[PDB]
Amino acid sequence: GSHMAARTDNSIVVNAPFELVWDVTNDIEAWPELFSEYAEAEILRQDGDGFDFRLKTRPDANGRVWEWVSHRVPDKGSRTVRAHRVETGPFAYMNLHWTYRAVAGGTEMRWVQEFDMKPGAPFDNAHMTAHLNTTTRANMERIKKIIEDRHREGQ
Amino acid sequence: GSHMAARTDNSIVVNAPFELVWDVTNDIEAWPELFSEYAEAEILRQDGDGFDFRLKTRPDANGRVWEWVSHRVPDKGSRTVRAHRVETGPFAYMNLHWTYRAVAGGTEMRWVQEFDMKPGAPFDNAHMTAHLNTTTRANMERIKKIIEDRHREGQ
């Protein structure tokens, strides 16, 4: 039979210039602090064009933990980032696309995820879509707050 | 006439492994967030063995702001970092030495600063010593808290 793939599309404006928002959000070493969702973020190797890194989440409200490896390709020149899952997990596939658009007073981050769950996975498209929206919004809001706070150079 | 140079010696134990404490404290991009004292931390160039970077403080209680360039040389293999001021400012000289010692449950950071103020500088050895101790302790405590918090992988 046929079915539709899943997708998430979230945005948030960070009151800081592109350079800072880009540098912070792409500083993998800081991810476990920047993202409340990530317990670990380990770069495994630099595939030249991009890199492969392992991510592991902090347990969610139910105690579930996710861990996977993804190939990430940042492209500062194009103010864009793309990545996709490479392991055999519940996701048939999962790819990401981040854009950083200049707006009055800051940078608007837009994160898009396109995926499809394997049949029988603990989470189906509907459930995972809800889970990802919740965590993504939480992550983007924490990141906004952290960046804007460090961006203040006064007292 | 003769006089004695100044020195500060501060320590704090961070409940995290060397790798994490080292990586975080040497991630210059994160300094404006890690250190409440730094408004900016910009790497200017990589002098091969080390690098030169510009630092600018957030105003202190009196509204005073410091900005300087220093040559920093991290040496992970030796678990040590050394740096020194290169500009013509109120400091006749200022050099730093950080050590990371393994202790039960964590890493003890020890930061030592050796310096001497130029005569006529707004701050003399005594005043600057007090200022540096206050800010250093504040910085080390914030860093301890941040690292230990991100180090927790549970809920």
Curated annotation (Swiss-Prot), chains A, B:
What domain of life does the UniProt record list for this protein's source?
Bacteria
Tell me the null mutant phenotype.
In the absence of TcmN, the linear polyketide intermediate formed by the minimal PKS consisting of the TcmJKLM proteins undergoes spontaneous cyclization to form some TCM F2 as well as SEK15 and many other aberrant shunt products.
Q: What is the effect of changing Q113H?
A: Strong decrease in the production of the first ring
Stated consequence of mutating W66N = Decrease in the production of the first ring
Provide the residue span(s) of the region labelled Polyketide cyclase.
14-143
- Tell me the impact of changing Y38T: Strong decrease in the production of the first ring
Effect the entry attributes to changing Y38A:
Abolishes the production of the first ring
Active site (catalytic residues): S70, R72, R85
Subunit structure, interactors included? The tetracenomycin polyketide synthase (TCM PKS) is composed of a ketosynthase complex (TcmKL), an acyl carrier protein (TcmM), a cyclase (TcmN) and a probable second cyclase (TcmJ). TcmN is a homodimer in solution.
- Family of this protein: In the C-terminal section; belongs to the class I-like SAM-binding methyltransferase superfamily. Cation-independent O-methyltransferase family.
* Function statement: Involved in the biosynthesis of tetracenomycin C (TCM C). Part of a type II polyketide synthase (PKS) that catalyzes the synthesis of tetracenomycin F2 (TCM F2), a precursor of TCM C, from malonyl-CoA. The TcmN N-terminal domain, when coupled with the other components of the PKS, catalyzes the cyclization and aromatization of the linear polyketide intermediate. Catalyzes the cyclization of the first and second rings. In addition, the C-terminal domain acts as a methyltransferase.
Q: What is known of its domains?
A: This multifunction enzyme is comprised of two structurally and functionally independent domains. Contains a highly conserved interior pocket. The size, shape and composition of the pocket are important to orient and specifically fold the polyketide chain. The accessibility of the hydrophobic cavity is regulated by a dynamic equilibrium between open and closed states.
Q: What is this protein called?
A: Tetracenomycin biosynthesis bifunctional cyclase/O-methyl transferase TcmN
Record organism = Streptomyces glaucescens
Q: Which gene encodes it?
A: tcmN
